[PDB]
Amino acid sequence: MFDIGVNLTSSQFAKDRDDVVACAFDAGVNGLLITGTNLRESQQAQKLARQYSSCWSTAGVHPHDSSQWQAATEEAIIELAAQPEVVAIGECGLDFNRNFSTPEEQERAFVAQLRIAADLNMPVFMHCRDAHERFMTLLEPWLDKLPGAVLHCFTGTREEMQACVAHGIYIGITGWVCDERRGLELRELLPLIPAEKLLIETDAPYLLPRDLTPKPSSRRNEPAHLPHILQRIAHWRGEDAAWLAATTDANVKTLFGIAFLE
């Protein structure tokens, strides 16, 4: 198995990062992709990915941080992207929340990063929150000249999922599926996701699985909880966990062009 969504740069891991990674590995997670959400965090992520075996990172600017996009940002992204730890441009995309960055600022930063990924022939690590129509409209002239893309932390409808996978987009499922109140629609479309488009993630330290037992007092999520998520997803899909683990691992290698041990 493989966690495509780990905010390992988070302050929540500052004291025990070596152990968090090692615990993830001891629990059978074969590799991590560390999220970059702005320029400095992307820089930290790449530094951390050097520190551990089977760790990679993304380089980019989250739509929340899109207001900081500048003329020098592109070159900085490319400088990072040139490094072998960096395997995707992102996290980038749209969130209909405009309080931290305007839709104008979001669209501009998003298109800019799609352009970089096309120039570098790299896949994109994407994010879409209540913005499917605008999102696909901007993606359209770029996605086909990209090696691939993932919609990480997918929270859309069944039709929206089907619209995305038609264009090759991988669907990233977190522990939110395990939320009884809030993850129902997600859980119900789950078996309809094509196996070869399915990717798995914790989004640690966030989205601690509600059906996880036992839970920490800190309520901090960690990649070591990935096997729980995979097992729940496999069950709801009516599949063997070992099989889906192999499938999703292949999806990661197909998408990011990386190699890691099974």
Author numbering: 1 to 262
Paper text:
TatD is a conserved protein widely expressed in different species, including bacteria, fungi, plants and animals. Here we provide lines of evidence showing that TatD is a 3′–5′ exonuclease that processes single-stranded DNA in DNA repair. TatD represents the first example of a TIM-barrel exonuclease that hydrolyzes the phosphodiester bond at the 3′ end of a nucleic acid chain. TatD has a TIM-barrel fold and it trims DNA from 3′-to-5′ ends in the hydrogen peroxide-induced DNA repair, including double-strand break repair and nucleotide excision repair in E. coli.
To characterize the biochemical properties and examine the structural basis of TatD in DNA degradation, the full-length E. coli TatD with a C-terminal His-tag was expressed and purified by chromatographic methods using a Ni-NTA affinity column followed by a Q-Sepharose anion exchange column. The gel filtration profile showed that TatD formed a stable monomer with a molecular weight of ∼30 kDa at pH 7.2. TatD has a TIM-barrel fold, forming a barrel made of eight β-strands surrounding by nine α-helices. The electrostatic surface potential of TatD revealed an acidic pocket on the top loop region of the β barrel with a patch of basic surface next to the pocket. This acidic pocket is likely the metal-ion binding site and the basic surface on the side with several basic residues, including R98, R129 and R219, is likely involved in DNA binding. Since the E. coli TatD does not bear these two histidine residues, very likely it belongs to the Group I TatD that are activated by Mg2+ but not by Zn2+. In summary, we suggest that the conserved acidic residues E91, E201 and D203 are responsible for binding of metal ions, and H62 for playing a critical catalytic role in the active site of E. coli TatD in DNA hydrolysis.
